[PDB]
From a paper:
Kinesins are a family of microtubule-based motors that play important roles in intracellular transport and cell division. Kinesin-1 transports cargo within cells, a process tightly coupled with ATP hydrolysis. Here we characterized kinesin-1 P-loop mutations that interfere with ADP binding and determined the structure of the corresponding mutated nucleotide-free kinesins.
Together with the observation that the T92V fluorescence does not increase upon incubation with mant-ADP, these data indicate that T92V has lost most of the kinesin affinity for ADP. We first determined the 2.0 Å resolution structure of T92V in a P21 space group crystal form. There were two similar molecules in the asymmetric unit, with a root mean square deviation (r.m.s.d.) after superposition of 0.47 Å (305 Cαs compared). The main difference between T92V and wild-type ADP-kinesin is the missing nucleotide and magnesium ion in the T92V nucleotide binding cleft. Instead of the nucleotide, an electron density, well accounted for by a sulfate ion that likely comes from the crystallization solution, is located close to the missing ADP β phosphate. However, in apo-T92V, helix α4, which is C-terminal to L11, starts at residue D249 instead of residue K256 in ADP-kinesin-1, i.e. is two turns longer. Finally, whereas T92 interacts with D231 in wild-type ADP-kinesin-1, this hydrogen bond is not formed in the T92V mutant, as expected. Therefore, we conclude from these observations that the T92V mutation disables Mg2+ binding, which would normally stabilize the ADP association and limit its release, and leads to a nucleotide-free kinesin without the need of an overall structural change towards the tubulin-bound apo-kinesin conformation. Therefore, an ADP-kinesin-like conformation can be adopted both by nucleotide-free wild-type kinesin and by the T92V mutant.
Author numbering: 7 to 238, 248 to 324
The structure:
Amino acid sequence: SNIKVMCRFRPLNESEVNRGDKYIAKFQGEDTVVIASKPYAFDRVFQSSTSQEQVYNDAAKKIVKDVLEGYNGTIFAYGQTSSGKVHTMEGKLHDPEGMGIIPRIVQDIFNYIYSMDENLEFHIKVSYFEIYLDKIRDLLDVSKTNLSVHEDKNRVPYVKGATERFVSSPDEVMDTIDEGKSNRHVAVTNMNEHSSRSHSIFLINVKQENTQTEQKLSGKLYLVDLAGSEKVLDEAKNINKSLSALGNVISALAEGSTYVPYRDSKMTRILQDSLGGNARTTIVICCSPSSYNESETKSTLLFGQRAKT
């Protein structure tokens, strides 16, 4: 199994401080967090004061290199609502300090590409879509609202009709993310409720061709901001279904099973060529350190434990 799991704790938020919550996360070394005297070991644990830069460097940087070598990959943000998933995945998009994983990935991709000599030709294209109530919508074309999953020649599942946009700079990709977030408001009355109950999926497809040696390489990287994992409606059941499917896929891979139940959900089907097999995966579980959220945090930590070999 190629899955790594890293746990990120955010600082206590304003409500938590005012309410008088206790900081219940205890840290041991760089890989362990202990809750109520019970330890949970991961590939890495980030404490509340961990910077965006360091999170990227541990969770994502190496996967970006693999994608530039022709690997596929997935990076997930998992955790209850307000645990810091979007701050981690997106952060402040145009801010060199505040930017999250996706902007740093894109920068790294282009930094490598523009440094290469004339023998290499690159084509970078991005897609951005969401899954809500078990329906796929293109965030770059809001007329595309119930996209189906299809399989190509080589039995590779794909989203039929999803917008694929060619990009040639990090600024252009950020502009694409900005447009997607704005488009996401279409037909949505409450964004907080919607975003907490849907999964957002950003895809970067990096194709390269050395015209001198006549070699081609292609790498796909999916960046997934999952629905909130909290136990707190048709929305709930759909969300339970999609995360439980991902859970079973992760456990199957962690067991070294040859059979992996990708078909358990649309999402895992979509990610089939970039999750398991020879693809690289990091799950970043996000948690509140507040005593008030102790039950959901334990649940999040136990979800992360699934990837343990």
